[PDB]
Amino acid sequence: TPAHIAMFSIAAHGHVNPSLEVIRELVARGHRVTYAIPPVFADKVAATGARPVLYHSTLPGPDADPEAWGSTLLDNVEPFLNDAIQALPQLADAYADDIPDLVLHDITSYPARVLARRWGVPAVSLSPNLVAWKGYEEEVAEPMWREPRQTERGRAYYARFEAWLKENGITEHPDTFASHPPRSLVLIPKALQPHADRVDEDVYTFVGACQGWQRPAGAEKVVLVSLPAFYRECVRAFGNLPGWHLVLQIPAELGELPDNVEVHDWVPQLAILRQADLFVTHAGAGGSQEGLATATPMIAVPQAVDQFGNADMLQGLGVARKLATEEATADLLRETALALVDDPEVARRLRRIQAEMAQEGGTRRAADLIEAELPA
Numbered sequence: 001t002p003a004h005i006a007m008f009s010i011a012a013h014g015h016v017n018p019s020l021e022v023i024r025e026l027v028a029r030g031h032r033v034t035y036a037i038p039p040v041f042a043d044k045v046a047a048t049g050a051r052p053v054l055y056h057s058t059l060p061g062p063d064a065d066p067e068a069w070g071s072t073l074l075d076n077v078e079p080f081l082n083d084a085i086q087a088l089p090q091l092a093d094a095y096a097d098d099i100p101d102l103v104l105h106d107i108t109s110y111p112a113r114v115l116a117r118r119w120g121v122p123a124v125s126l127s128p129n130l131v132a133w134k135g136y137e138e139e140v141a142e143p144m145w146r147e148p149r150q151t152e153r154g155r156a157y158y159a160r161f162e163a164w165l166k167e168n169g170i171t172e173h174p175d176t177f178a179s180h181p182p183r184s185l186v187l188i189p190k191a192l193q194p195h196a197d198r199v200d201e202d203v204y205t206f207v208g209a210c211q212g213w214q215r216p217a218g219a220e221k222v223v224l225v226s227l228p229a230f231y232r233e234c235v236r237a238f239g240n241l242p243g244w245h246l247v248l249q250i251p252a253e254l255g256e257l258p259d260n261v262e263v264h265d266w267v268p269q270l271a272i273l274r275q276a277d278l279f280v281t282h283a284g285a286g287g288s289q290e291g292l293a294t295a296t297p298m299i300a301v302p303q304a305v306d307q308f309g310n311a312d313m314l315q316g317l318g319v320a321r322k323l324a325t326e327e328a329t330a331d332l333l334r335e336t337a338l339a340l341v342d343d344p345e346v347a348r349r350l351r352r353i354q355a356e357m358a359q360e361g362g363t364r365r366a367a368d369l370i371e372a373e374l375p376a
């Protein structure tokens with residue numbers, strides 16, 4: 001009698017954590033939720049109340065080095081196809097006698113898309129990062145693929161992808177299949193989406209609200225640094241700076257610590273950000289999102305190209321300064337920190353963005369929108 005919603009993802013934190021609360025909420029509303037997942041994340045998934053449906057994925061495990069996921073475009077993308085080809089039959093079999101009413105999936109799951117179509121039920125894509133805007137194909141996708149696509153390997157990748165879709169009754173081009181879902185909930189704030197003005201809001205809905213430690217007395221400004229020489233620059237930057245208190249998430253090669261510095265291997269990030277006045281971050285999604293949700297200005301120290309994207313966005317919003325690790329020295333860190341925490345306009349902008357995020361809604365709204373897709 002309860003509707004059966006089948007969620008699909010892979011064993012990667014960034015492709016599971018962002019929708020965990022949505023899944024929990026759907027279970028709380030009485031829906032029967034199953035969640036296709038590799039065994040390493042069975043416990044994680046079961047904790048939401050959803051039933052794990054186990055399958056073997058050939059993608060790197062959640063603890064693998066980022067290098068394992070590849071350095072080139074083809075190296076990054078082929079694994080998702082290879083995985084999908086071998087995962088599809090496993091999942092088809094697992095669900096054969098219990099076809100769901102609706103398919104939910106993280107963007108990485110090609111099998112979810114295929115099965116939704118095979119089963120004749122709606123699919124809802126859940127994006128943990130930015131989505132395509134109108135013009136993306138000409139502006140980003142085509143230029144990006146222009147060279148690899150014309151190589152032998154590239155031609156054979158796309159040939160293989162087309163054939164696989166053809167074997168499952170799909171005639172959409174693989175680029176459409178992969179990058180252009182019919183319906184998507186975007187789990188990042190619109191503020192972190194490039195060209196958000198050209199995103200098709202009949203397809204995509206931004207639901208980026210941040211639905212997902214004690215400040216020392218005498219601390220007038222609290223700075224959290226989260227994700228060597230850089231940590232020591234931070235110690236020199238904030239150590240014994242009057243009124244400041246530094247929380248360093250990093251481990252005895254930092255040297256002697258001043259009294260206003262505390263170091264942890266792990267910290268409750270969101271809990272500290274609620275009581276923090278500055279956040280030094282690598283500017284991945286999540287970090288960027290929690291900074292905005294807590295109206296905490298940021299020093300963005302990006303390294304992995306997308307972070308350079310988030311960082312430029314944040315800096316474009318006037319709520320962060322982007323620094324290279326070459327610039328990330330004590331004097332510049334301190335100067336930047338003083339300038340950001342003392343700027344009433346930075347604070348005003350953060351309040352605006354925080355309010356916009358609240359309006360997007362998060363968990364409750366996402367669950368509503370998923371229910372609205374129940375062919376019902």
Ligand code: NA
Pocket residue numbers: 273274275276277278294295296
């Ligand atoms: Na804050």
